[PDB]
Structure formats: structure tokens, C-alpha cells
Amino acid sequence: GFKELIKRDLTTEVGNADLSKLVENQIVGHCYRGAFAAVEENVQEIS
Amino acid sequence: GFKELIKRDLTTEVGNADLSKLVENQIVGHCYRGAFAAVEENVQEIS
């Protein structure tokens, strides 16, 4: 009942530096993923 | 007493440009410099 969708893992890219202010490139990471879960598989315990 | 401090001589770098307006890269020069002076070294003179 549990499935992991991985279109793309972590991917870091750098850009959008503003030379007019001497600010360095915006370092940005992104990820494409999805998780499918269910209550049909679980029982929740106490202690 | 007079000493010159240099961390970057002169760093010219072309960067962000507005492609939509057909603007070319902004060329921005900069330098990290500093100077140390003193009163223990100098005598002012008039005429």
C-alpha cells in the first residue's frame, strides 16, 4: 500500500546574481517526488 | 607608517543582462583595498 514516486532527486542550480549590488548567485535546490500511503496497512499502538 | 592593503587588485566581471530589452551584460569592476596612514610621519607646510 506504500509507493514512492521519484521523477527527479535533489538538483541544485546557481544563478540570478545581481552584479549591480555585488550579491552572489542564488543557490537553489529542487526535487520532484511523490508519496502514496494508506490506512489499509497500519495499526496504531499505544506504548 | 604608510602601508597599502590589497585583497583584490581589480576584478572586472560581466553579469546579468536584460535579454527582453536586448541589453548587453553589465560590466562591473570592483576592488577590495585599504590604506593605513599616520600623523607620526608628516609635517604640513604653508607656501
Side-chain angles (χ1 to χ4, degrees):
Chain A
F2 297 101
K3 279 160 187 297
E4 174 182 32
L5 318 179
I6 316 180
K7 194 190 190 300
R8 193 178 297 172
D9 309 85
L10 181 67
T11 301
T12 300
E13 45 175 17
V14 299
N16 287 15
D18 201 347
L19 273 292
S20 69
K21 298 167 87 187
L22 302 191
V23 73
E24 282 285 343
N25 295 265
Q26 282 170 8
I27 176 155
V28 172
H30 73 86
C31 171
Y32 298 141
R33 274 191 192 225
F36 179 64
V39 73
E40 282 70 23
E41 316 306 332
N42 274 33
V43 160
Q44 181 260 324
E45 303 169 3
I46 295 92
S47 300
Chain B
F2 294 104
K3 280 169 190 293
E4 183 178 1
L5 310 171
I6 317 181
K7 189 192 189 302
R8 272 191 204 276
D9 292 275
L10 169 57
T11 300
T12 312
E13 53 183 320
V14 297
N16 54 356
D18 202 354
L19 274 298
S20 57
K21 300 174 69 56
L22 302 191
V23 165
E24 268 292 355
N25 301 343
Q26 294 179 351
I27 181 159
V28 166
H30 69 89
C31 65
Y32 295 120
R33 299 184 81 89
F36 179 74
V39 72
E40 289 77 11
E41 315 295 308
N42 281 40
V43 168
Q44 182 178 66
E45 312 176 1
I46 295 90
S47 296

